[PDB]
Design an enzyme around this catalytic site. Structure first.
Site, short mmCIF file in Angstrom:
data_model
loop_
_atom_site.label_atom_id
_atom_site.label_comp_id
_atom_site.label_asym_id
_atom_site.label_seq_id
_atom_site.Cartn_x
_atom_site.Cartn_y
_atom_site.Cartn_z
N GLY A 144 0.90 -1.16 0.00
CA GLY A 144 0.00 0.00 0.00
C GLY A 144 0.92 1.19 0.00
CB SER A 204 5.74 -3.58 2.27
OG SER A 204 5.87 -2.60 1.25
CB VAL A 205 1.78 -6.88 4.81
CG1 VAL A 205 1.53 -7.98 5.83
CG2 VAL A 205 1.15 -5.60 5.28
CG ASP A 225 -8.83 2.52 4.23
OD1 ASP A 225 -9.68 2.71 3.32
OD2 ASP A 225 -7.65 2.17 3.97
N1 LIG Z 1 -2.49 -10.14 10.33
C1 LIG Z 1 -2.55 -10.39 9.00
N2 LIG Z 1 -2.75 -11.65 8.53
C2 LIG Z 1 -2.80 -11.90 7.20
N3 LIG Z 1 -2.66 -10.95 6.25
C3 LIG Z 1 -2.46 -9.67 6.58
C4 LIG Z 1 -2.40 -9.29 8.01
N4 LIG Z 1 -2.19 -7.97 8.05
C5 LIG Z 1 -2.14 -7.51 6.76
N5 LIG Z 1 -2.29 -8.54 5.88
C6 LIG Z 1 -2.32 -8.44 4.40
O1 LIG Z 1 -1.56 -7.33 3.94
C7 LIG Z 1 -2.42 -6.34 3.34
C8 LIG Z 1 -1.99 -4.93 3.70
O2 LIG Z 1 -2.00 -4.75 5.12
P1 LIG Z 1 -2.68 -3.46 5.78
O3 LIG Z 1 -2.52 -3.53 7.29
O4 LIG Z 1 -4.08 -3.30 5.23
O5 LIG Z 1 -1.73 -2.25 5.30
P2 LIG Z 1 -1.83 -1.38 3.95
O6 LIG Z 1 -3.26 -1.43 3.50
O7 LIG Z 1 -1.29 -0.06 4.44
O8 LIG Z 1 -0.92 -2.07 2.94
C9 LIG Z 1 -3.79 -6.64 3.88
O9 LIG Z 1 -4.83 -6.16 3.02
C10 LIG Z 1 -3.76 -8.16 4.04
O10 LIG Z 1 -4.04 -8.82 2.82
MG LIG Z 2 -5.04 -1.99 4.16
#
Ligand SMILES: Nc1ncnc2c1ncn2[C@@H]1O[C@H](COP(=O)(O)OP(=O)(O)O)[C@@H](O)[C@H]1O
Ligand SMILES: [Mg+2]
Ligand SMILES: [Zn+2]
Lengths: 312, 90
Positions: A27, A31-32, A137
């Site tokens: 996003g 990054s995740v 959001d």
């Molecule tokens: N605890 C979690 N378990 C599994 N997937 C996750 C988790 N947290 C985030 N993700 C994945 O990563 C994506 C991005 O995380 P998010 O916290 O929404 O941050 P951003 O939207 O700023 O990238 C999420 O839409 C989800 O698909």
């Molecule tokens: Mg998100």
């Protein structure tokens, strides 16, 4: 892959704890990553490592962490295991919840699964609202759903703000969006789209209505708009331009519109767009979530008491 | 004045500048398009400055100065509240 290596380099301590396998999210603010770790207690655990963009103010980082620490871990709100930091690099570690893509399951949910989904979204929203968190959001990519396991998690407090009487102290120090950090236009309530200075927990209820709209109509994204006023134009075509102008007056905004468009009957709209026996209570609840007036819009607590959710 | 179609929004108490939408056509609900299609089918908060390259802004001295300071104590205060229950390797 170079991302993995550069995450390790920015936060060296991650080397000692996690085998980082994949990048599962990106996003503008984070990054995740998916990772494996060993628990002291015995088993290995799949972990989500959320790497916040190093440009985020400490207050913003701390606030999200605080929402996860204080409100999370319960009632379908994600919680936090730990948080790692080197300098401006901050990584939040959460239990990984394996989840469906919303698009993929949209047209395959049974009606009962649609009731459970919504009931579980309102439990999370109720939780966060009792703490005075406005999520800002709410949308399918921030509400994680495991179909197989019947598990649900509200995530992503990167845009959150506090109500006037918020229980999350750090959220008081977060610059208001209307004052100064923007969501997906198509899930944003009319009072957000019109830049109303007073934005309450009601904006989250609108977003749950948009999700519910997608669920009932089989269309996602329902409102497809790259900016706020296009989403507003699209809302007017669903809820009526006259009805939207009237409601906006009540929150200090004056909308002028070129073409008058009539409000749509929700049942007929969804049915034509899209189980044989969807109750009236579903469209009645939908009508309340998409209440154009944020003062009268249904709350999470009232939504859980709605006839649509008997008996669950 | 304004070419149609348009939407115009203004604050009743002058708090904002007026803003506008103009498109070729207003949104039209399209029932013919197949499901699941829509029926309607940087800046650094730390240095308080607009940047052009994230990586290069990150590697600038003013960003480096903020990154290595007491500013993240607010984050460390919360972290110190959490139980570490992973196994750590040397
Ligand atoms: N605890 C979690 N378990 C599994 N997937 C996750 C988790 N947290 C985030 N993700 C994945 O990563 C994506 C991005 O995380 P998010 O916290 O929404 O941050 P951003 O939207 O700023 O990238 C999420 O839409 C989800 O698909
Ligand atoms: Mg998100
Ligand atoms: Zn900076």
């Amino acid at each position: 892959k170079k991302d993995i290596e550069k995450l390790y380099e920015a936060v060296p301590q991650l080397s000692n704890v996690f085998k980082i396998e994949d990048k599962i999210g990106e996003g503008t603010f984070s990054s995740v990553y998916l990772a494996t770790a060993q628990l002291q207690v015995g088993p290995e655990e799949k972990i989500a490592l959320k790497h916040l963009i190093p440009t985020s103010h400490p207050i913003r980082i701390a606030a999200e962490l605080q929402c996860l620490t204080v409100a999370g871990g319960q009632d379908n709100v994600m919680g936090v295991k730990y948080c790692f930091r080197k300098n401006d690099h901050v990584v939040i570690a959460m239990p990984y919840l394996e989840h469906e893509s919303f698009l993929d399951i949209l047209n395959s949910l049974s009606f009962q699964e649609v009731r459970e989904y919504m009931l579980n979204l309102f439990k999370a929203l109720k939780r966060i609202h009792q703490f005075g968190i406005v999520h800002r959001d709410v949308k399918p990519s921030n509400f994680l759903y495991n179909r197989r396991l019947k598990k649900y998690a509200l995530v992503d407090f990167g845009l959150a703000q506090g109500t006037h009487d918020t229980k999350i102290e750090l959220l008081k120090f977060v610059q208001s969006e209307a004052q100064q950090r923007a969501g997906t236009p198509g899930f944003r309530a009319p009072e957000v789209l019109t830049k109303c200075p007073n934005q309450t927990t009601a904006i989250d209820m609108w977003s749950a209505g948009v999700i519910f709209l997608s669920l009932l109509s089989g269309r996602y994204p329902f409102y497809k708009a790259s900016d706020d006023l296009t989403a507003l134009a699209q809302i007017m075509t669903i809820r009526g331009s006259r009805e939207t102008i009237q409601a906006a007056k009540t929150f200090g905004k004056s909308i002028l519109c070129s073409k008058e468009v009539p409000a749509q009957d929700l049942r007929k709209l969804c049915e034509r767009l899209r189980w044989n026996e969807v109750p009236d209570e579903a469209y009645d609840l939908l009508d309340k979530l998409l209440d154009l007036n944020p003062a009268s819009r249904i709350t999470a607590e009232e939504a859980l008491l709605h006839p649509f959710f008997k008996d669950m | 004045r304004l070419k149609k179609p348009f939407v115009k929004v203004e604050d009743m108490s002058q708090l904002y500048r007026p803003f506008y939408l103009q498109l070729t056509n207003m949104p039209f609900i399209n029932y013919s398009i197949q499901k699941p299609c829509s029926p309607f089918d940087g800046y650094c908060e730390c240095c308080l400055q607009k940047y052009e390259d994230l990586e290069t802004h990150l590697l600038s001295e003013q960003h480096r100065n903020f990154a290595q300071s007491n500013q993240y104590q607010v984050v460390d205060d919360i972290v110190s509240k959490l139980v570490f229950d992973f196994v750590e390797y040397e």
